[PDB]
Ligand binder design. Structure first.
Ligand code: NA
Lengths: 197, 229, 240, 253, 232, 235, 242, 234
């Protein structure tokens, strides 16, 4: 019902998410942000059940910030993705399972750019591109068709726009605006939102 | 319970309660261990205060599992605690890995229990040193585990009364290529250095460990070895 | 001294001094007696009155531990009452488990083992109390047991605890109680208490009498005022 | 019971923790243990106290413990206390790897065990662990590293340090010949043999050396063979003999 | 070395006796109850000019109608102050009303002999609080002043002095206290007695003053207000 | 001296010095008197003021509509024991819908206060009580002590110089059962007065009165409410 | 006889490696003033101990040191009375619990080993004292015949041909080791009589049926049996004819 | 569980265990804190064979708060990690970041608890906590083993805290605060009263309003030491 998308290029990770906060038949917020900064070079995009998403994302964020304070360096995107997986998997068979679907996008000095997909069951996959929500059923084939591993950030935003246009055209849910950010060797960069009249 | 340690460091950096536990071992009846090329021998002085003692009721040389055996010097009642715990630990290893516990693994697990009793609240250390034998990698093993929780792999060693002299006799009479039968003869000879009186098959106890596992020698087998002297 | 501060410490000669000191508190206390006869058990207590301001019956030293069991104490009274509660709860537990009245030897064994448990550790102190348990059943007869601070429990024909324990004992030995009834034994109990009481040293006192036997239907109860007054008048007249 | 209570975690009037200080006294009696950090590796050289004709060699080493794929350590003190701590160091390292799917950065493994030692000096009423540890390792943050920890739960990183018997004498001897940034594993091995020769009384069977190097993106931890130790020891005798010639002949001319 | 719950041959717990002695080392505080309000005044005892005097809090607000003056080990008082504040808010939540000055004093007093070693929770109190408190506020019974010591004994006072020079300040309060005195006269007498017993010369930074009046909430005096009162 | 610091340690004389030291706490506190007639149980107390500027410490506490107490000893221990009594009384009305028999409440105090006298690191309650009550057995005056022992009393006095009060009560105890409430309170006040030196007398500042009876729920009289009782005699 | 710190007050090693508190527990056994003897025969095992009833005021039937642990296991206790009843109670529990978990009557050696193991804990943990008592158990083993086992306040335990406990333990064991060295049949009568005559010669007392108590187990009747004054008198009068 | 009362009152009204913990602080390296106008400075007194990084006594608790300590360094590490966890736990429960006073209050209550709970001895450290609240006000606070805390304009803890405090009392002027470079020199000037050589034995870190903690390298410290000698002769 909410949309997340990530496209990993040779030296960057492009991510986008819808900006709707909804309750029942009403769009309560048109400028809502579903991205969470973990480190200077890591974003956690989170989607799912109403309480779970912010509770889970914030807990991981503060523990990632605690690691930075205790050791003087930040966790790598891989270590952060695995730490997120460990918490989600530990809650799975517990009294409190979190119904969250997420994407972790990061940049590491040594490993380069990375995109991780995680579902509410805590399965973790490294992907060149990925999407979450009903929107992924309409946009995954667009990325299969046009994505190449050497895709430039300029071309990646065009591809992202192609995906977001398909939702406007065929998806029954409103979703008019999208948050867009890109991560590289210089950290997290805010791009202009994708908007439709 | 008392939640504070009873063993503490003295100003000279000593754990005086472990040193006093070692004095209990030093006062105990002699014990010998000899790792032969094809097996291990454990021999001990099982001398009793009277004829009225039923010799075959209690044992000093004890099996832990099918391939591991034990002997000791020091406190008899403390020893039984360690035998029960060692037998238990060997069964836990077997349930998990479905393979008989390597001698070094059993020694390490029993040494940990012994170390606990030097730091845990309201307890004194064990006044026992163990001599553990075994057969596992197609090769024999002999270990000593003392009251502090420290262990040592030995080719041959002595513990208890007159142990410093037993170790010198072993030093000159030990060869890495000795066979199990010859090592039993040598083990009884080390005990005879400090034995006060006449040595019969009822006042000494011998245990062996080879490819066929660990077992105690019957008094008839001990009699045949004593015939050779 | 040194070896006498904890019940978890033996002295070099194999003694537990904290238990012996708890027994001294019993010896320093007033005298209580118990006598087993042909048809029951009779209790008598020399209850010294510390103040004329107290009510008659205050600081009772005779208790109903079960409907068929009575308890007579000597020593530290708060410890004694605590032991009466342990005995009550123990007797109640037996009835819940088996559906009938706890046999007195069993009740004594059970209570004595709580007492014993307080003689092994530094965490707790031994009870400063010695007590007797009396009962009467048709299948069991008359039964009198006595437990001391160490945890020892024995069966008795005659028994005395406190200040004049040995003085009351030589007076009890003069009775052939095996062929006597509760009704005649009450007079004897009051008499022995009046003999051992030290008028000079312990000014005034109240005689406490209890009994459980064939007469009471195996129920432990107070000896009625009239029989108590007859035994009390008899005790005073024999003293002359 | 207050009569029998040793009071192990209390302060002395000078703000001192006596059980910790008494544990440090024990460490002085244990075998000499040193660590030297070089540009291409890091090493541990330790005096062997289990030297006896009738001892059997069943383990790879006596005082060297592999902790993880990129780390190893050496101890000085109560060897049963060292077995407790080394086992815990392995559990901490496996717990970090299970959580982040990356090996525990060297300093983090040290601080983790040190917090346990520290707890033993503040509460619990228990005696402290009578062990001092030397840690050698490699990580993607600081590369080759050397650490030292005490019964107090106190630690520090070092270029070269010593624990155990004649520690101060060995440290000052290291202080003279250690050249910062210009040490190779070859020169550090010769310094380890030089320092041990003086702080002991020197057969290869009374010493134990281990090196930590990087080979093809993988960490290599190896305890040197008895022959290899004889070669380093022999070269040291051939340097002391050459040194005696550059004193008797360099005074006449 | 005896335990913390050992009685002396005189019938007092040693640890409580010594906690009373610890208050004889705290800075002196005075409280005066008057039909027009209660005033609380205390000496800050500033050790260095580099220390921020605004960060020495010896008079605190428990609730709008209740204030607290403290003396002794000030870190120990911080726990009792917060427990008092929590009790007022728990009472407000449940009963929809303010607590009486006496009920708040009693609530804090219930924690007094809650120390010990054997039969206790993992991190329970090992010793008493080395604090003396002066609660001052207004309720349906009018202005009231209450005293409390480490033993937990709490009592109502018309005038009370606690701390190092409590013996001398109580003498001065006894000779100057009149039941029908005004709030202005009580404030001045407090400042006079404090100037007398204080080592340093009293100024608007060295001391703390507060009033709780019927009709006025708890008020901490500002530097400008303290200087205007110092004049007389 | 070595048998001095623990309740678990018996001295060689069969004495527990820690219990005997706790008993002293009662003797240090001000005197209180408790006495009874056929219809009323009365408690009278001397309230101690720390200074002329301080109020006189509350000596009389309410437990239930049918029970009230007078304290002597550590006030925090008195508050703890009073709260225990109040709860035990509340449970009895919740479960049985009937007031707790006074003698049964006193037994609970004896069991409760004995526990710490037999366990290491624990201490006796340093407080003594005088308990006024009224139930199916009429009025009562009970006495509880740090030793965990308890007494059923005709009348009683505890605290500093309380032997003086006991001498008066021992003489007039023949009159007590037939006294009317004013005659009974007067007797209690005269016994309380005996403890006081010859200089000072009973005022409406240092006198506290507690009354329970056949027609009266436990009521506490303290300042102006004390005046009707203090008009009966002049030394 | 070296001492350091609290080694005479609690169960911690002395500088020589002794446990003074355990040594003191052996001295506590003799405090009772009694002596016990247990003798094993060809087809039986008998226990005998002094029955000192000095007061007619006691109910002599409640004054005993012989206890039934199970139907086929009986014991004689020497030492501190309450400690001994506590140990008997524990033995009874351990025996009943063994049958519940394993489905067979506990062997005498196993019950003795278990009591000895429980006793060893008191020897190693400081908060409690060892029991100042000694347990001697008897019973017929299905495969091993009659058994006599003894356990210590030290935690030691052993099987015996004949044994003793109490004040005259050393004197009774010297008597028994002389009697066992001579070739005897060891019938029931010989075993009962050797036990009675060991105690009599050692205490220098000609016994009366009320001055001793005897407990027995046989291959024919393995149930623990306590002898009556009449049955004990039969043995005493048979011993008089020699 | 070990339930012995470690810190108890002595006959005179003293808490000896807490006073003994203050003796351990007195033996620690001198730590100095100075609160300037747009900057806060921490300086700590100082083996060639030692890695300096592994033994720094100036730690960051959060982006806006940092601290220095004097006393038992292992104890300090425990206090520091608890303060660090608390800063994140504060952001998680209330969203907004911690104030210098909030985290000082947390550290002080932790220290006080260890002076009144069974089985524990007090922490043998004193702390100088500096930073900027969200509103931008610079802060300096000091905690000690007892659990007391106060705000300061400037302060010193550890070895020779008395003589360095007296120096700061005379040299803390509005002219000495005027520039960010002048306040840094004040910490150096004060540290030179106890540190015999200076520069080589000084660890110094600064925190500017919206800037994160900045550790000054030895060459930077040598520059400010050289500037002091110019002022000294002129
Ligand atoms: Na013990």
């Amino acid at each position: 019902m909410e949309y997340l998308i990530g496209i990993q290029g040779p030296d960057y990770v492009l991510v986008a998410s819808d900006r709707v906060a909804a309750s029942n038949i009403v769009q309560m917020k048109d400028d809502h942000d579903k991205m969470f900064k973990m480190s200077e070079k890591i974003l956690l995009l989170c989607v799912g059940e109403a309480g779970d998403t912010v509770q889970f994302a914030e807990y991981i964020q503060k523990n990632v910030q605690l690691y930075k304070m205790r050791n003087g360096y930040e966790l790598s995107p891989t270590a952060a993705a695995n730490f997120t997986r460990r918490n989600l998997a530990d809650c799975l068979r517990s009294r409190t399972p979190y119904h969250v679907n997420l994407l972790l996008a990061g940049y590491d000095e040594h490993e380069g750019p990375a995109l991780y997909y995680m579902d509410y069951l805590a399965a973790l996959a490294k992907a060149p591109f990925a999407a979450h929500g009903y929107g992924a059923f309409l946009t995954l084939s667009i990325l299969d068709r046009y994505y190449t591993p050497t895709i430039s950030r300029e071309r990646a935003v065009e591809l992202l726009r192609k995906c977001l246009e398909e939702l406007q055209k065929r998806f029954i849910l409103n979703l008019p605006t999208f948050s867009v950010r890109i991560i590289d060797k210089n950290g997290i960069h805010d791009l202009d939102n994708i908007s439709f009249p | 319970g008392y939640s504070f340690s009873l063993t503490t460091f003295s100003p000279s950096g000593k754990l005086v309660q472990i040193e006093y536990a070692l004095a209990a071992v030093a006062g105990g009846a002699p014990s010998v261990g000899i790792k032969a090329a094809n097996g291990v021998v454990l021999a001990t002085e099982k001398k009793q205060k009277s004829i009225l003692y039923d010799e075959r009721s209690v044992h000093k040389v004890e099996p832990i599992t099918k391939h591991i055996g034990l002997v000791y010097s020091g406190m008899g009642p403390d020893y039984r605690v360690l035998v029960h715990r060692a037998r238990k630990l060997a069964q836990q290893y077997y349930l998990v890995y479905q393979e008989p516990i390597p001698t070094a693994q059993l020694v390490q697990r029993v040494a940990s229990v012994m170390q606990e009793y030097t730091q845990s609240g309201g307890v004194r250390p064990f006044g026992v040193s163990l001599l553990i034998c075994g057969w596992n990698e197609g090769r024999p093993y002999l270990f000593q585990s003392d009251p502090s929780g420290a262990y040592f792999a030995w080719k041959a060693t002595a513990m208890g009364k007159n142990y410093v002299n037993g170790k010198t006799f072993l030093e000159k009479r030990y060869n890495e290529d000795l066979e199990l039968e010859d090592a039993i003869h040598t083990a009884i000879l080390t005990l005879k250095e400090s034995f006060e009186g006449q040595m019969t098959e009822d006042n000494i106890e011998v245990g062996i460990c080879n490819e066929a596992g660990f077992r105690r020698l019957t008094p008839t087998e001990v009699k045949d070895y004593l015939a050779a002297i | 001294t040194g070896y006498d501060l904890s019940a978890s410490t033996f002295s070099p000669d194999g003694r537990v001094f904290q238990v012996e000191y708890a027994m001294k508190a019993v010896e320093n206390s007033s005298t209580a007696i118990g006598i087993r006869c042909k048809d029951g058990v009779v209790f008598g207590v020399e209850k010294l009155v510390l103040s004329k301001l107290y009510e008659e019956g205050s600081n009772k030293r005779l208790f109903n531990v079960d409907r068929h069991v009575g308890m007579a104490v000597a020593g530290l009274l708060a410890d004694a009452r605590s032991l009466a509660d342990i005995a009550r709860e123990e007797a109640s537990n037996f009835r819940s488990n088996f559906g009938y009245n706890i046999p007195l030897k069993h009740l004594a064994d059970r209570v004595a083992m709580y007492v014993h448990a307080y003689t092994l550790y530094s965490a707790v102190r031994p009870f400063g109390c010695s007590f007797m348990l009396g009962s009467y059943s048709v299948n069991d007869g008359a039964q009198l047991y006595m437990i001391d601070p160490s945890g020892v429990s024995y069966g008795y024909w005659g028994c005395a605890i406190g200040k004049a324990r040995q003085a009351a004992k030589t007076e009890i030995e003069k009775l052939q109680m095996k062929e006597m009834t509760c009704r005649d034994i009450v007079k004897e109990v009051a008499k022995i208490i009046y003999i051992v009481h030290d008028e000079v040293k312990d000014k005034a006192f109240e005689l406490e009498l209890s009994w459980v036997g064939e007469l009471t239907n195996g129920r432990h109860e107070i000896v009625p005022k009239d029989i108590r007054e007859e035994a009390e008048k008899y005790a005073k007249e024999s003293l002359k | 019971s207050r009569r029998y209570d040793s009071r192990t975690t209390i302060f002395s009037p000078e703000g001192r923790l006596y059980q910790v200080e008494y544990a440090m006294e024990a460490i002085g009696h244990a075998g000499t243990c040193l660590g030297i950090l070089a540009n291409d590796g890091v090493l541990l050289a330790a005096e062997r106290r289990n030297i006896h004709k009738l001892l059997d060699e069943v383990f790879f080493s006596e005082k060297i413990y592999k902790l993880n794929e990129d780390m190893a350590c050496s101890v000085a003190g109560i060897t049963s206390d060292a077995n407790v701590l080394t086992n815990e160091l392995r559990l901490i390292a496996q717990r970090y790897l299970l959580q982040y799917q990356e090996p525990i950065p060297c300093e983090q493994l040290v601080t983790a065990l040190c917090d346990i030692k520290q707890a033993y000096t503040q509460f619990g009423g228990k005696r402290p662990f009578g062990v001092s540890l030397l840690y050698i390792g490699w990580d993607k943050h600081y590369g080759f590293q050397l650490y030292q920890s005490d019964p107090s739960g106190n630690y520090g990183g070092w270029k070269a340090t010593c624990i155990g018997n004649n520690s101060a004498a060995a440290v000052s001897m290291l202080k003279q010949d250690y050249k910062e940034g210009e040490m190779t594993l070859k020169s550090a091995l010769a310094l380890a043999i030089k320092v041990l020769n003086k702080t002991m009384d020197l057969s290869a069977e009374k010493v134990e050396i281990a090196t930590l190097t990087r080979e093809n993106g993988k960490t290599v931890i190896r305890v040197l063979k008895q022959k290899e130790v004889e070669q380093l020891i022999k070269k040291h005798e051939e340097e002391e003999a050459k040194a005696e010639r550059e004193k008797k002949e360099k005074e006449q001319k | 070395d005896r335990g913390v719950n050992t009685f002396s041959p005189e019938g007092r717990l040693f640890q409580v006796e010594y906690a009373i002695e610890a208050i004889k080392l705290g800075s002196t505080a005075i409280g005066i109850q008057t039909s027009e309000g209660v005033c609380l005044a205390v000496e800050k005892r500033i050790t260095s000019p580099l220390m921020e005097p605004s960060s020495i809090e010896k008079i605190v607000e428990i609730d709008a109608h209740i204030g607290c003056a403290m003396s002794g080990l000030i870190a120990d008082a911080k726990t009792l102050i917060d427990k008092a504040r929590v009790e007022t808010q728990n009472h407000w939540f449940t009963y929809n009303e303010t607590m009486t000055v006496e009920s708040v004093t009693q609530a804090v007093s219930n924690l007094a002999l809650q120390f010990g070693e054997e039969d206790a929770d993992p991190g329970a109190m090992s010793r008493p609080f080395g604090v003396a408190l002066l609660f001052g506020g207004v309720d349906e019974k009018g202005p009231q002043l209450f005293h409390m010591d480490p033993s937990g004994t709490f009592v109502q006072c018309d005038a009370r002095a606690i701390g190092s020079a409590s013996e001398g300040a109580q003498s001065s309060l006894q000779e100057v206290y009149h039941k029908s005195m005004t709030l202005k006269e009580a404030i001045k007498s407090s400042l006079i007695i404090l100037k007398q017993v204080m080592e340093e010369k009293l100024n608007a930074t060295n001391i703390e003053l507060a009033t709780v009046q019927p009709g006025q909430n708890f008020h901490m005096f500002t530097k400008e207000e303290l200087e205007e009162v110092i004049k007389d | 001296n070595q048998y001095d610091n623990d309740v678990t340690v018996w001295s060689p004389q069969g004495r527990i010095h820690q219990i005997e030291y706790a008993m002293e706490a009662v003797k240090q506190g001000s005197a209180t008197v408790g006495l009874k007639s056929k219809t009323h149980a009365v408690l009278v107390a001397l309230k101690r003021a720390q200074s002329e500027l301080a109020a006189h410490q509350k000596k009389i506490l309410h437990v239930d509509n049918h029970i009230g107490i007078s304290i002597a000893g550590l006030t925090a221990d008195a508050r703890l024991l009073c709260n225990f009594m109040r709860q035990e009384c509340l449970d009895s009305r919740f479960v049985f819908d009937r007031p707790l028999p006074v003698s049964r409440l006193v037994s609970l105090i004896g069991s409760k206060t004995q526990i710490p006298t037999q366990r290491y690191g624990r201490r006796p309650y340093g407080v003594g009580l005088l308990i006024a009550g009224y139930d199916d057995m009429g009025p009562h005056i009970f006495q509880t002590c740090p030793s965990a022992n308890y007494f059923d009393c005709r009348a009683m006095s505890i605290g500093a110089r309380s032997q003086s009060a006991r001498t008066y009560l021992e003489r007039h105890m023949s009159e007590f059962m037939e006294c009317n409430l004013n005659e009974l309170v007067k007797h209690g006040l005269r016994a309380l007065r005996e403890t006081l030196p010859a200089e000072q007398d009973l005022t409406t500042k240092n006198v506290s009165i507690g009354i329970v009876g056949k027609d009266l729920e436990f009521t506490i009289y303290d300042d102006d409410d004390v005046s009707p009782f203090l008009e009966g005699l002049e030394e | 006889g070296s001492s350091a710190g609290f080694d005479r007050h609690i169960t911690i090693f002395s500088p020589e490696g002794r446990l003074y508190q355990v040594e003191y527990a052996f001295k506590a056994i003799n405090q009772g003033g009694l002596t016990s003897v247990a003798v094993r025969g060809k087809d039986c095992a008998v226990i005998v101990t002094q029955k000192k009833v000095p007061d007619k005021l006691l109910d002599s039937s409640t004054v005993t040191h012989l206890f039934k642990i199970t139907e086929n296991i009986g014991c004689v206790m020497t030492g501190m009375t309450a400690d001994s009843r506590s140990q008997v109670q524990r033995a009874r529990y351990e025996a009943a619990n063994w049958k519940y978990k394993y489905g067979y009557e506990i062997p005498v050696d196993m019950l003795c080993k278990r009591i000895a193991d429980i006793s060893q804990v008191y020897t190693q943990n400081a908060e409690m004292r060892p029991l100042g008592c000694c347990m001697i158990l008897i019973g017929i083993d299905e495969e091993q015949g009659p058994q006599v086992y003894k356990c210590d306040p030290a935690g030691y335990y052993c099987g015996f041909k004949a044994t003793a406990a109490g004040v005259k333990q050393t004197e009774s064991t010297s008597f028994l080791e002389k009697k066992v060295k001579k070739k005897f049949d060891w019938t029931f009568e010989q075993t009962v009589e050797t036990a009675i005559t060991c105690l009599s010669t050692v205490l220098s007392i000609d016994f009366k049926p009320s001055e001793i108590e005897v407990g027995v187990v046989t291959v024919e009747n393995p149930k623990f049996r306590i002898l009556t004054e009449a049955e004990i008198d039969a043995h005493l009068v048979a011993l008089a004819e020699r | 569980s070990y339930d012995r009362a470690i810190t108890v009152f002595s006959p005179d009204g003293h808490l000896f265990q807490v006073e003994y913990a203050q003796e351990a602080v007195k033996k620690g390296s001198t730590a100095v804190g100075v609160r300037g106008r747009d900057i806060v400075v921490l300086g700590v007194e100082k083996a060639k064979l030692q890695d300096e990084r592994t033994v720094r006594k100036i730690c960051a608790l959060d982006d806006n708060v940092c601290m220095a300590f004097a006393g038992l360094t292992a104890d300090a590490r425990i206090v520091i990690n608890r303060a660090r966890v608390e800063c994140q736990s504060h952001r998680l429960t209330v969203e907004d970041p911690v104030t210098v006073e909030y985290i000082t209050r947390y550290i002080a209550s932790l220290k006080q608890r260890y002076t009144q709970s069974n089985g524990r001895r007090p922490f043998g450290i004193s702390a100088l906590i500096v930073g900027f609240d969200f509103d931008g006000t610079p802060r300096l606070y000091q905690t000690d083993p007892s659990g007391t805390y106060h705000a300061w304009k400037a302060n010193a803890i550890g070895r020779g805290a008395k003589s360095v405090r007296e120096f700061l009392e005379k040299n803390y002027t509005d002219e000495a605060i005027e520039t960010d470079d002048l306040t840094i020199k004040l910490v150096i000037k004060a540290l030179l009263e106890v540190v015999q050589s200076g520069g080589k034995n000084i660890e110094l870190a600064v925190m500017r309003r919206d800037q994160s903690l900045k550790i000054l390298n030895p060459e930077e410290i040598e520059k400010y030491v050289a500037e002091i000698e110019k002022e000294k002769e002129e």
